[PDB]
Amino acid sequence: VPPLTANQKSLIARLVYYQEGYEQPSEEDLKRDMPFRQITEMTILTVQLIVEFAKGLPGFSKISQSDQITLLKACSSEVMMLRVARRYDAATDSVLFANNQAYTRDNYRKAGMAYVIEDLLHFCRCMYSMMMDNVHYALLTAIVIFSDRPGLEQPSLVEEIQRYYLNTLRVYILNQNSASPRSAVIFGKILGILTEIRTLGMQNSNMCISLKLKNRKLPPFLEEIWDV
Amino acid sequence: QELSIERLLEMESLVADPSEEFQFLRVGPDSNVPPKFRAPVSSLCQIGNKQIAALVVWARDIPHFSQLEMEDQILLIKGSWNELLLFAIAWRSMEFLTETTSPPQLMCLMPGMTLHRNSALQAGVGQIFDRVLSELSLKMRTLRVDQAEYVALKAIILLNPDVKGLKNRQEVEVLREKMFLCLDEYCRRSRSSEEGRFAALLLRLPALRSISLKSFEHLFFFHLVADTSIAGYIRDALR
Ligand SMILES: C/C=C/CC/C=C\CC/C=C/CCCCCCC(=O)OC[C@H](COP(=O)(O)OCCN)OC(=O)CCCCCCC/C=C/C/C=C/CCC
Ligand SMILES: Cc1cc(C)cc(C(=O)N(NC(=O)c2ccc3c(c2C)OCCO3)C(C)(C)C)c1
For ligand 1, atom 26, name the residue with the nearest CA.
B123
- Listed in sequence order, the residues at least 6 apart from B56 whose beta carbon sits closer than 8 Å to its beta carbon are B77, B81, B234, B237, B238
Q: How far is B172 from chain A (nearest CA, A)?
A: 13
CA–CA distances in Å: residue A166 to residues A150, A212, B188: 20, 37, 17
CATH number at residue B39: 1.10.565.10
Interatomic CA distance for residues A85 and A97, integer angstroms: 9
Task: Give chain A's domains with CATH numbers.
Answer: 1-228 (1.10.565.10)
**Are the C-beta atoms of residues A139 and A191 closer than 8 Å to each other?**
no
* Contact between residue A152 and residue B147 where contact means Cβ atoms under 8 Å apart: no
Nearest to A100 by CA among A38, A176, A181: A38
**Alpha carbon distance A204, B120 (integer Å):** 27
Mutating to test ligand 1, I would choose from B115, B122, B223 the residue with most ligand atoms within 8 A of its C-beta, which is B122
**C-alpha span between B90 and B123 (Å, rounded):** 19
B183 interaction partners in chain A (CB closer than 8 Å): 184, 188
- B173-176: list long-range contacts, CB under 8 Å, 24+ apart: B175/B3, B175/B64, B175/B65, B176/A188, B176/A192
Approach to solving: X-ray
Strand partners, B107: B115
Would you call B93 exposed, middle or buried from its count of C-beta atoms within 10 A (0-12, 13-18, 19+)?
A: buried
Q: Which residues pair with A89 in a beta bridge?
A: A94
Cα B87 to middle of ligand 2, angstroms:
29
Measured from the CA of A79, which atom of ligand 2 is nearest? 5
Query: What span, in angstroms and rounded, lies between the C-alpha atoms of A22 and A83?
Result: 10
Measured in angstroms, how far is the CA atom of residue B230 from the centroid of ligand 1?
21
* Cβ-proximal residues to B222 (8 Å cutoff; 6+ apart), any chain: B27, B31, B32, B33, B41
Q: How many CB atoms lie within 10 A of CB A78?
A: 24
Whole-angstrom Cα distance, residue A163 to residue A169?
Answer: 10
Spacing, Cα A204 to ligand 2 middle (Å): 6
Taking the CB of residue A26, how many other CB atoms lie within 10 A of it?
A: 15
Beta strands (DSSP E) in B100-197 are: 106-110, 113-116
Distance in Å from the first CA to the final CA of chain A: 48
- Of A43, A199, A212, which is best to mutate to test ligand 2, by the most ligand atoms within 8 angstroms of its C-beta? A43
Name which of B55, B60, B79, B53 is nearest B162 in CA terms: B79
Pocket-testing residue among A38, A99, A207, ligand 2, by greatest number of atoms within 8 A of Cβ: A207
Q: How many domains does chain B have?
A: 1
Q: Is residue A83 within 8 Å of residue A46, measured between CB atoms?
A: yes
Give the Cα separation of B208 and B135 in Å (integer): 8
Ligand 2 pocket by C-beta < 6 Å: which residues?
A: A 39-40, 43, 77, 80-81, 84, 103, 116, 119-120, 200, 203-204, 207-208, 211, 222
Read out DSSP for A33-74?
A: --THHHHHHHHHHHHHHHHHHTTSSTTGGGS-HHHHHHHHHH
Phi, psi of B6 (to 5 degrees): -75, -60
Nearest CA in chain A to B184: A184
- A73, A52, A143, A187: which is closest to B198 by C-alpha? A187
- B225 C-alpha vs ligand 1 centroid, how far in Å? 12
Residue B15, domain extent: 1-239
Task: Specify the residue with its C-alpha closest to ligand 2, atom 20.
Answer: A204
Per-residue b/e over B70-84, b at no fewer than 16 CB within 10 Å? eebbbbbbbbbbbbb
Query: Residues, chain A, total?
Result: 228
Query: Cα(B82)–Cα(B111) distance, rounded to whole angstroms?
Result: 18
Torsion angle in degrees (nearest 10) through CA of A171, A173, A176, A182: -120
Distance of alpha carbon B140 from alpha carbon A201, whole angstroms: 25
Cβ distance of A188 and B202 shorter than 8 Å: yes
Q: What is the DSSP string of A149-216?
A: -TT-S-HHHHHHHHHHHHHHHHHHHHHHTTT-SHHHHHHHHHHHHHHHHHHHHHHHHHHHHHHHTT--
Cα distances (Å, whole numbers) of residue B202 to A131, A150, B196, B206, B207: 20, 18, 10, 8, 10
How is residue B225 annotated by DSSP?
B
Nearest to B210 among A181, A189, A202 (CB): A202
Q: Is A94 helix (H, G, I), strand (E, B) or coil?
A: strand
Residues near B25 by Cβ (< 8 Å), separated by ≥ 6? B45, B48, B49, B52, B219, B224, B225, B226
Answer whether A149's CB lies under 8 Å from A79's CB.
Answer: no
**Identity (one letter) of the amino acid at A18?**
Y
Q: For chain B, how many residues are written?
A: 239
Whole-angstrom distance, CA of residue A129 vs CA of residue B109:
39
Q: Which candidate, B97, B113, B140, B41, places its Cα nearest to that of B105?
A: B97
Query: What's the N-to-C CA distance of chain B in angstroms?
Result: 20
Count CB pairs under 8 A between chains A and B: 70
Please indicate whether residue B108, judged by its CB atom, sits closer than 6 Å to ligand 1.
Answer: no
Q: Which ligand is closest in space to the CA of residue B113?
A: 1
Contact B196 A170 (CB under 8 A): yes
Minimal Cα–Cα distance from B18 to chain A, Å? 33
As a whole number of angstroms, the distance between CA B66 and CA B48 comes to 24
Q: Strand A88-89 to strand A94-95: parallel, antiparallel, or no bridges (unpaired)?
A: antiparallel
For B231, phi then psi, to 5°, come to -50, -55
Residue A169 CB partners (closer than 8 Å, separation 6+): A135, A136, A139, A140, A143, A187, A190
Contacts of A213 (CB under 8 A, 6+ apart): none
- Cα–ligand 2 centroid distance for A4 (angstroms): 37
Q: Do A28 and A45 meet the contact criterion of CB atoms below 8 Å apart? A: yes
**Residues B30-45 as b or e (16 or more Cβ within 10 Å = b):** eeebeeeeeeebbebb
Residue contact B180–A189, C-beta within 8 A? yes
